[model samples]
Target: PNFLFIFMDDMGWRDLACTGSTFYETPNIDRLCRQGMVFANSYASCPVCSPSRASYLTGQYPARLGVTDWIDMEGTSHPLRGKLIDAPYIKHLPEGEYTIAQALKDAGYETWHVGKWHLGGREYYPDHFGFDVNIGGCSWGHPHEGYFSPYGIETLPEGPEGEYLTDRITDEAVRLLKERKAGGSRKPFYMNLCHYAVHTPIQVKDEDRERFEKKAREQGLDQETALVEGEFHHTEDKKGRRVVRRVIQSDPSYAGMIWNLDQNIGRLLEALSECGEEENTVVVFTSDNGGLATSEGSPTCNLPASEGKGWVYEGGTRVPLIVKYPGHVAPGSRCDVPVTTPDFYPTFLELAGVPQKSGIPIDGRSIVPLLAGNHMPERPVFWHYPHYGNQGGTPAASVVLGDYKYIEFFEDGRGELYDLKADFSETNNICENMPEMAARLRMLLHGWQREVCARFPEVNEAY
Candidate 1:
């Protein structure tokens, strides 16, 4: 089976129309939901980009790879602080770690990664990690410049002019699909159509901009959704201070950007049909992490969902996971079981008929059983995010077992617990209320963390 993983950066779990997102129209994604299975409680290991991405690629906890923070630019406020702070250690994953691309490539699949590759140093770049094509994929957490032209800002490759980054990636994906069909290679294709969309500096096409404006006016929220700055630009706040603008949730541009992304997804699906490979292809659609309050642009915030990306809140880690595999995944199905990005490795491997005997321990279990219409019994899903910034607060680690989620703030050595089933928005703190449950979860979390520590050199000696 061919694999088409459409991974977006900073998209909220409820951003798509089918997920009941009211901000924009996402007919394509909605269609995917109708034809595929959507996991309502899917999550990412880290709320930030790089570490979450690493977890997905390695199929192991980020801490196991010692990648605790997002990749950052040099000489900036948040520099690429390597896996280690000021100590000497082998921070990044060693060369032979079983990356999905390597496994697929070795099995004769054509591997391509088109966007955001913020795994680690240059050695971990797509080419080095076995991808056939790496368009706009870089080590930086995000591109420094605008998405339209010349990919990167200082030292990064600039994206092509006029083409939105999301659209460009989708177009390339379509092209790859065509090549896979024409080549008559049944080896199966694995394409990671990662997008920088719905991230920051909201870039929307002219048509989408007009549509959003009309929608806001129709919704009687014209003033609330009106454009404050005609175009999206980074600027500082008053008091001679600087503030990184979170995406305007209610802004027309924000809606427009999501609409554009949804449209491209539709195009991708159409391409699959045109290639006559729709039935055999396994299309997995998800995001690197939950949407950020500022990533997308005005009133469309992940309201009621928690602070947004960069925190361990459900709003930051939880994401929409939709899979369409025709005969495999049931149509119009919703699974409340918790799943994470790390599961993609084993799940894709099992679906693709690839052998995973690389000896590297995989933290994610295969969701193939769930796809077969069987209920996935309760299991533990873990997350570790030891850094700070962006999400209004910080959480060092989190663990979700069944309906309960426990979080620990490393800086303060404090913890909180929540019953997700009862409080989907995570408004209630059950940590103090349910001491016994919290203690049980805390002990489990410590055991898991200890196991992960034994796998790699200590990046945080203080811990």
Candidate 2:
């Protein structure tokens, strides 16, 4: 079976048409929901990009790999040292431990990586690790300034001029599918079509933005409303920092950008159908991390939740996950089992009937059973975030067991607990009322951290 992994950047859990995005329509993604299983309680391992992608790619915690932040390249500002640091992070996925692409390639599968590849240095690139084909992948976050030409910094040979980045990625993927079909290479293919869309700078074509703005007006929202004025009702962080965000309403450009993304998704689906591979292909759609309230030039739009992106809150960790494997995953079914980015390795391995990668114990359990027709037993999912940024959260870590979620902020040793089953929005704190539960969960979090991340040093005092 072929694997077509579609990963978006900084998309939130509720931003999909099926997930209740009120601002814009996501018909293509919603169509995917109808053809597969959707996990309601899925989460990213970290709120940041590189770290979360590392965890998903390696099936290990970001802390274990030492990539707790986004990868930086030359000509970009480094928040830690104020200048670009060459080889700042050496914690790219180690050899011996396998990536999905590596496993597939070894199993006589063709591998392609198109779009964002922010894992690490050039030495640890997609081609070096496993992928046989790579297009426009690099070490920098927000590699292309906008989806168009010159790619934010400098132009690359593969970077096309005036073409939308998302469309370019899909076009490349579709071309590969056509080649495989023509070559009669019966080997299964693994294509990681990672789009650097909806991330930062929020730049979009003028025509697309006009359409979305018109749609917003049709939904009873005005063009000048504060909600559309780039402040998704969250003007400041809890600490009062003026968060930079994309003006989704005023910025008609961003709306068009998203519309283009949706169009490309439709195109990919159409291509699969044309090749008669739609049913056999296992297409997994998810985001690298939570939605960004404000990044580059975009604004916060996640509502009923305090802020967007870079936090330990549900708004930052919770992400939309739709896995489509015809005859396997239930159609339009929803699973509430708590799962995280690390779980993808084991789950995909099981789906592909591949053996678990040896050398390290698997941190993520297989969720294929849940997709097939079984409910997962209640288990604890852990998150450790000891840094701070625009995520509107203190330095924190968390452990979720059953319905209870216990979180601790590393800055002040502050802790809180929430019953996710009842407070899906995390509006109230139950830590004081359930001290015993909090303590128990805390012990669980500490034990796992010690066992897996004993060598990491303590966080800096700045955060």
Model 2 segments more than 4 A misplaced: 74-91, 152-161, 223-241, 244-252, 294-300, 454-463
Residue-level lDDT of model 2, residues 57-94, one tens digit each, is: 77878766767766655534333310111123434555
Alpha-carbon TM-score of each model against the true structure: 0.88, 0.89
Q: What's the CA RMSD of model 1 in angstroms?
A: 4.9
Residue 235, model 1: lDDT of 17
lDDT of 1 by residue, 1-463 (tens): 8898888888888788888576678988889999999997788877878777878887888877777667654535342122322212233555777789988999888899887776656776788887888876766566566667666532234444675667777877787788878888666788888888877777777898999889887887665533233222211112232323333346678789888888888898999999988898898889887776642333345656775687788778878889999987889998877788889999988987777975679988889988887876677888776554443443368889988989886544688899988997898899999999999999998899898882222244333
lDDT, candidate 2, residue 286?
92
Regions of candidate 1 where Cα sits further than 4 Å from its true position = 79-94, 152-161, 224-249, 294-299, 454-463
lDDT of each model, Cα atoms only?
0.74, 0.73
Counting only residues 3 or more apart in sequence or on different chains, how many pairs clash (N, Cα, C under 3 Å) in candidate 2? Answer: 11
Worst 10 residues of 2 by lDDT: 78-87
What lDDT is reached at residue 21 by model 1? Answer: 77
